[PDB]
Design an enzyme around this catalytic site. Sequence first.
Site, mmCIF file in Angstrom:
data_model
loop_
_atom_site.group_PDB
_atom_site.id
_atom_site.type_symbol
_atom_site.label_atom_id
_atom_site.label_comp_id
_atom_site.label_asym_id
_atom_site.label_seq_id
_atom_site.Cartn_x
_atom_site.Cartn_y
_atom_site.Cartn_z
ATOM 1 N N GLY A 240 3.520 2.150 -2.792
ATOM 2 C CA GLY A 240 2.406 1.478 -2.166
ATOM 3 C C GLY A 240 2.360 0.220 -3.203
ATOM 4 O O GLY A 240 3.550 -0.076 -3.091
ATOM 5 N N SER A 241 1.350 -0.520 -3.329
ATOM 6 C CA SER A 241 1.441 -1.798 -3.839
ATOM 7 C C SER A 241 1.572 -1.896 -5.131
ATOM 8 O O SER A 241 1.918 -3.145 -5.426
ATOM 9 C CB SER A 241 -0.573 -1.471 -4.094
ATOM 10 O OG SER A 241 -1.256 -2.051 -2.790
#
Length: 498
Positions: A240-241
Site C-alpha cells: 500500500g502507501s
Amino acid sequence: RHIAIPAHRGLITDRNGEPLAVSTPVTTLWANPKELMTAKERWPQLAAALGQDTKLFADRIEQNAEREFIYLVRGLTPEQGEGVIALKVPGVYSIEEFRRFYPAGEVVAHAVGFTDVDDRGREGIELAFDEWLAGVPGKRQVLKDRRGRVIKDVQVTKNAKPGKTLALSIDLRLQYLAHRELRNALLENGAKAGSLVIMDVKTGEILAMTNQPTYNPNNRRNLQPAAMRNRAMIDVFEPGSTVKPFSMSAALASGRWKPSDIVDVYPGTLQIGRYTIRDVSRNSRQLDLTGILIKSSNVGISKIAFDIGAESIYSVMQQVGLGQDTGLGFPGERVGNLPNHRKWPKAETATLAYGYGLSVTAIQLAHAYAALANDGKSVPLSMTRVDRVPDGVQVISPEVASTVQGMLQQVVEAQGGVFRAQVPGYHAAGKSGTARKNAYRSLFAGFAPATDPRIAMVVVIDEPSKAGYFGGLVSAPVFSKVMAGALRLMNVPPDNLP
Ligand SMILES: *C(=O)[C@@H]([C@@H]1NC(C(=O)O)=C(S[C@@H]2CN[C@H](C(=O)N(C)C)C2)[C@@H]1C)[C@@H](C)O
C-alpha cells in the site's frame, strides 16, 4: 559394517560473537540386538535406566532380533551415557555425538532455525548454510563374527572434519530490543502477530528480523503452528502507501515533477471510467508532493502516475527489489509478485502507484527503503556479517534519493505528520501504511538519522478480526522506540543539532 563418526558442527554467533547455535557433546546409546538377545535378564534394568516401559522395550528388541544396529536413546549427557554403559549390558555401546543448543532461544528462533535428529540443518540459517556449518563425518569399520560378537573395530576408516564458524549479520542487542518492543506493541493493540526488520543501509546487513509469535528451538515438542512461521520472509502482502515514495521517485526522475509542484485532489475522490479512487483523509484541494505523502492521497499519487506512466513506477519498484528474489537463499523465503503488465490501463496504473498492485514481504520492503536511504544505492541483502561491502547498484539517482529522503523526513517531522514516529535526539523519515492480503496489516517503513541515514526499519503489526489499525498510530510508535534504541546501541551521533 560402518558406523559414522559425527563431526562437530560449526558455531553460529551474532555479529559481535555472541553464541546463537552451539554443537554440544552428547552420548547416544546403541545396541546390537543379536548380542542383546543373549542377555534377556538385563533388559528390564536397561529399559528402567532409559525410563522406558519394560514390555515396549522388550517388544522393540524382539522385533529387531535379526538386526545388528538399533538406537536405544540419543542425546544423553556424557555422565548419563556413562552410567548406562556402566551396567555392562552385553551388546550395548555408546557413540559420542553432538546436539545443537540455542542460547538466545526464542529471541532469534526463525533467523537461526534448527537441525533435525541427525544434526542436519532443517530451518533458517542452519539449513541455508548447512554445507559451511556441517563438516565431514568420519567412518569406523565394525567387523563381527558370522553373527553378533564384535571381532574387530580394526580401525577408523576416516577421521571427522569439523564444520566452520559463522557470524550472522544479526546484532543480538538490536534483535532483543526489536523482540521486546514488537511483543509490547502486540499486547498494547490487541494484536497477535507481526514482524520487525532492521537493516544496515550501507552494507545490506539484516541487523534484526523478529517475528511474533515465536518459539523455543530447544523445546520443539508440539508447539503452536503459527509460532513456526518466519513472517518477515514468508508473509506476502500488498504494501500500500509504504511504496508511494517509490512512485514519487519515478515522478522526480521523469523530468516532469518537482517537490513544490502542486496536484489538486479535491474532493478526495477521482472518477476514472467506471472506477472511483478514494482517499481515506479527505480535507484537501491543492497539495505539493510532500503533502501527497503527508495526507497519503491516493488521488494525488494516481494523477502523477497518469502523467508519468506506470512503466516508470514499475521499473523503480522492480529496481529496488519489490516482488523480486532477495538472493539470500534462505529456506522458505517468498518472492511475492510485481506484475509487469507492459501496458497499464488507468485503473491498474493508479492501484500500482498507491501499492495495491503488487505483493511483497517485510524483508523486501526494508531492503527497498535501505536503497532509498543509502542515497539510491542498493547493496545485496545479507544474513551473514559483511566485512567487505560489495559495490551494489545505483538503482535511484543520488539526487532523487536525497530529495525523497527529505520528503519522508517531513512526513515524520512536519505539522500534521506522523509525529509518533519521531526519534528523540535524531531526525527520522518514513511512511505509514495499511497493507492488504481481506486481511490487513498496520505498517511503518522508515530510516534514520534522516539527514545521514544508517538504519532502515520495517514494522508490521497484523490486524485482527475488526479494523481500526492506522499505521501512524500502531506501527509508528514501535519504529520510534526500536530506532531510538538501535541508533544508541550503534553509537550513531545525534544529527538533530543547532
Ligand atoms: C496507504 O497505506 C493508505 C493510506 N495510508 C495511510 C497512512 O498515512 O497510514 C492512511 S490513513 C489516513 C492518513 N492519516 C490519517 C490517520 O493516520 N488517522 C486519522 C489516524 C488517515 C491511508 C489508509 C492508502 C492506500 O489509502
